[PDB]
Amino acid sequence: MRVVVIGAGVIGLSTALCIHERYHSVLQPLDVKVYADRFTPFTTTDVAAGLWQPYTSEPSNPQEANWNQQTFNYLLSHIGSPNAANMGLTPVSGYNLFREAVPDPYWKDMVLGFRKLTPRELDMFPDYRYGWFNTSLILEGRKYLQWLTERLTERGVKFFLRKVESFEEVARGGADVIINCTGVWAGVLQPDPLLQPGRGQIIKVDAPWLKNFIITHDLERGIYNSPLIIPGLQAVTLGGTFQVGNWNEINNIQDHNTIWEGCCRLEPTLKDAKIVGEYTGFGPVRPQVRLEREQLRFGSSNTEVIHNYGHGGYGLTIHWGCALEVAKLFGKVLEERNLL
Amino acid sequence: MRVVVIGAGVIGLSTALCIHERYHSVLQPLDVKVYADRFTPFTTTDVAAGLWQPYTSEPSNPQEANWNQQTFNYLLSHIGSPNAANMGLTPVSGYNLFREAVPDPYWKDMVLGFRKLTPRELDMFPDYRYGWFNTSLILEGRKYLQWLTERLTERGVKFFLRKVESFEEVARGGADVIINCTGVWAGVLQPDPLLQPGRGQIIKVDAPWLKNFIITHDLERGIYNSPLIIPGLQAVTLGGTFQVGNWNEINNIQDHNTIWEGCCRLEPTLKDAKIVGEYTGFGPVRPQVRLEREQLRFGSSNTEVIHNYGHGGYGLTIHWGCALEVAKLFGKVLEERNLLAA
Numbered sequence: 138m139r140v141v142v143i144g145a146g147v148i149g150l151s152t153a154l155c156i157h158e159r160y161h162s163v164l165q166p167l168d169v170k171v172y173a174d175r176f177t178p179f180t181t182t183d184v185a186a187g188l189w190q191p192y193t194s195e196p197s198n199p200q201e202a203n204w205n206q207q208t209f210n211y212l213l214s215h216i217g218s219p220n221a222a223n224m225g226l227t228p229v230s231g232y233n234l235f236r237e238a239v240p241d242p243y244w245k246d247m248v249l250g251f252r253k254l255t256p257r258e259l260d261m262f263p264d265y266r267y268g269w270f271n272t273s274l275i276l277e278g279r280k281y282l283q284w285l286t287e288r289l290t291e292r293g294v295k296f297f298l299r300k301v302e303s304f305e306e307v308a309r310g311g312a313d314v315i316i317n318c319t320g321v322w323a324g325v326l327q328p329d330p331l332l333q334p335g336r337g338q339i340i341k342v343d344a345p346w347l348k349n350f351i352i353t354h355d356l357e358r359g360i361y362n363s364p365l366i367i368p369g370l371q372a373v374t375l376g377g378t379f380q381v382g383n384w385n386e387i388n389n390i391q392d393h394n395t396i397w398e399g400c401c402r403l404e405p406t407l408k409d410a411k412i413v414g415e416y417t418g419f420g421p422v423r424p425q426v427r428l429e430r431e432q433l434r435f436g437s438s439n440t441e442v443i444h445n446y447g448h449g450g451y452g453l454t455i456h457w458g459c460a461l462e463v464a465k466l467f468g469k470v471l472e473e474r475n476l477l
Numbered sequence: 478m479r480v481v482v483i484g485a486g487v488i489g490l491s492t493a494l495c496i497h498e499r500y501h502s503v504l505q506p507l508d509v510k511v512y513a514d515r516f517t518p519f520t521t522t523d524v525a526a527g528l529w530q531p532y533t534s535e536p537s538n539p540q541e542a543n544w545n546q547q548t549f550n551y552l553l554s555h556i557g558s559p560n561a562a563n564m565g566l567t568p569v570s571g572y573n574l575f576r577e578a579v580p581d582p583y584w585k586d587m588v589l590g591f592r593k594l595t596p597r598e599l600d601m602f603p604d605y606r607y608g609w610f611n612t613s614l615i616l617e618g619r620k621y622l623q624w625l626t627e628r629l630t631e632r633g634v635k636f637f638l639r640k641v642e643s644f645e646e647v648a649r650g651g652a653d654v655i656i657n658c659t660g661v662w663a664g665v666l667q668p669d670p671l672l673q674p675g676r677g678q679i680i681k682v683d684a685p686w687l688k689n690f691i692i693t694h695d696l697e698r699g700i701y702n703s704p705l706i707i708p709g710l711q712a713v714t715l716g717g718t719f720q721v722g723n724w725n726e727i728n729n730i731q732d733h734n735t736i737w738e739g740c741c742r743l744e745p746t747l748k749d750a751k752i753v754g755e756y757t758g759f760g761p762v763r764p765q766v767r768l769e770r771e772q773l774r775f776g777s778s779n780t781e782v783i784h785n786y787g788h789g790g791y792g793l794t795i796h797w798g799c800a801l802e803v804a805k806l807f808g809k810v811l812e813e814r815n816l817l818a819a
């Protein structure tokens with residue numbers, strides 16, 4: 138049985154590994170290949186802030202909260218392992234800062250040690266009047282992608298740098314199942330007017346003194362359009378823009394300024410931080426993750442397509458629950474072909 | 478008047494700056510000098526792990542508790558300032574790990590967000606069954622010493638290479654007041670058998686992924702003779718020996734192995750960490766800090782000495798309270814000569 142995963146971002150590769158690890162031992166034969174037109178370090182994943190944290194507001198689909206939880210438990214469970222850091226993973230603690238009282242987030246018990254900030258803590262941050270403290274996990278996009286491609290490759294899964302033009306051509310090339318993990322460009326293969334770019338720009342900086350995440354919110358401007366600081370494994374990510382609808386892949390001058398001045402004010406030690414790079418990427422914004430089976434019909438036979446895209450600004454955060462769910466749906470497909 | 482501070486470790490330079498800041502505007506002249514035979518990076522201070530945290534048990538002198546507290550609030554008050562990191566100062570969070578239930582430390586409300594660990598947190602650290610979480614402050618010895626010498630120099634305080642042989646020497650050189658901040662070597666200038674070396678060996682390592690401090694305790698083997706991991710501003714300190722009475726300044730292989738393997742066991746990601754140096758230093762261990770005024774007579778001059786030494790394995794943690802207290806006692810020396818403050 139031939140499976141082509143399209144996409145080598147976090148979603149693509151996580152899914153490929155989950156399918157393979159789940160079915161290799163039982164389905165003979167099983168051929169899994171990954172096709173993508175960019176690999177690390179050239180994916181949106183590579184440019185992610187690298188923090189586990191859902192949006193502040195509850196999810197529409199209740200399945201999404203479960204997926205986020207299963208992802209946290211999965212990642213956390215690696216912590217005492219020798220390889221957690223080679224995977225891109227380490228524990229970090231930090232602050233969410235608000236100008237007024239807000240409700241507790243749905244994820245308060247998923248993270249470790251959630252509590253509200255005290256007045257002394259708040260004086261660390263003069264511009265803000267309310268917030269949270271918790272411990273979470275760094276998951277570095279770049280490093281995680283290199284870990285997964287290594288695990289996948291060791292297991293015989295083969296990668297092809299190529300651009301896919303249609304589902305039809307891949308089916309015709311002999312795929313029995315296609316997993317569509319094309320991120321924000323999924324519309325090219327099948328129009329989807331709910332799918333939009335979430336344009337985020339970031340500044341990467343050497344400031345290794347900073348050991349905590351610091352996330353501000355502006356209620357009247359929408360999520361991640363206010364200053365955020367996230368220490369990564371070797372560098373710090375500085376953020377504060379997230380505009381849906383903008384397809385500009387180039388770094389913008391006002392966003393640079395929004396980010397630098399917002400963050401220099403949040404964290405004035407940044408004055409001595411060396412700029413390492415500045416980047417722009419597109420989160421696959423969609424009111425709901427598209428994670429569903431579709432049957433396609435070209436010549437003899439159906440080829441089965443399973444979509445997994447539209448994870449917005451939380452793909453690192455949610456990725457493993459989604460991979461598990463795709464692997465289940467793939468189980469159902471096998472069953473319907475009496476492959477077990 | 479003429480003040481000679483002996484010592485350029487954290488205690489020496491803290492105290493010098495605190496005196497100068499408090500009394501610059503009320504005395505004329507005020508001639509403050511620092512004499513030391515080692516300066517950064519060659520003091521014990523430079524080799525400290527760089528964390529704010531007192532001993533787990535209450536101190537003999539309860540004054541020490543306020544001194545630690547004042548130090549925290551002082552340091553904390555710099556967070557949100559543009560220069561906090563140039564001073565060696567940044568917030569950090571972390572874990573204290575125990576093999577059995579222990580009482581809360583007296584300093585639990587001084588730190589930020591003290592709580593007990595939950596079972597999932599405890600799963601991160603297999604060999605341990607109980608402990609704490611809190612946020613505290615890194616104060617890097619090396620950087621803080623550099624910041625202070627800069628601040629002190631800007632203010633007209635003068636530094637001299639000088640191995641002092643007696644208090645008499647310095648009095649007769651014309652010091653009116655001597656502040657004795659000589660750390661573990663204070664016994665040289667005035668015997669003090671309550672003062673002993675606390676030999677600590679450490680390994681410095683590049684492992685910038687580590688964001689939290691991690692301190693284990695072994696109630697039976699005494700304090701800091703259990704693995705400890707403390708991220709610094711750009712490298713990580715790996716520890717686990719603290720042996721009183723040992724004057725051996727050279728690194729030994731047995732403590733190396735105790736530290737490496739203990740810490741690899743605590744934090745197995747350390748397998749990929751690059752070793753970047755290994756050091757030994759001597760905490761000035763004393764049942765309590767010696768912080769007191771003494772009058773010495775040489776010819777018919779009275780000289781005032783104020784001691785500030787014996788801060789053991791917590792000099793960074795306590796230093797500012799002790800400097801403030803020395804400044805107090807200096808006020809009283811002034812007052813006794815009909816000189817006026819505020």
Ligand SMILES: Cc1cc2nc3c(=O)[nH]c(=O)nc-3n(C[C@H](O)[C@H](O)[C@H](O)COP(=O)(O)OP(=O)(O)OC[C@H]3O[C@@H](n4cnc5c(N)ncnc54)[C@H](O)[C@@H]3O)c2cc1C
Nearest residue numbers: 145146148174175181182186187188301320337452453454
């Ligand atoms: C600035 C920024 C910061 C972020 N920070 C975080 C964070 O801190 N935490 C978090 O959880 N999430 C974060 N996100 C969201 C996260 O980055 C995305 O949800 C995630 O990277 C999307 O993963 P993906 O694999 O779906 O898409 P991508 O990583 O973009 O992967 C898409 C893949 O599909 C391939 N592809 C597409 N079409 C074709 C085709 N036709 N032929 C061949 N190959 C194709 C591409 O080459 C690529 O391999 C952030 C996003 C941005 C922009």
Ligand SMILES: Cc1cc2nc3c(=O)[nH]c(=O)nc-3n(C[C@H](O)[C@H](O)[C@H](O)COP(=O)(O)OP(=O)(O)OC[C@H]3O[C@@H](n4cnc5c(N)ncnc54)[C@H](O)[C@@H]3O)c2cc1C
Nearest residue numbers: 485486514515521522526527528641660677791792793794
């Ligand atoms: C391995 C290790 C880790 C530690 N970690 C921590 C920690 O994480 N947190 C913490 O709070 N504390 C820690 N400590 C304790 C801390 O290092 C000490 O309490 C502190 O550095 C002592 O400061 P000091 O200025 O008294 O002495 P020092 O730093 O030793 O300075 C002594 C000064 O006196 C000078 N001097 C002495 N005699 C003479 C003389 N005759 N003439 C001229 N000059 C003289 C020396 O040259 C030097 O300038 C640690 C100690 C060790 C050994």
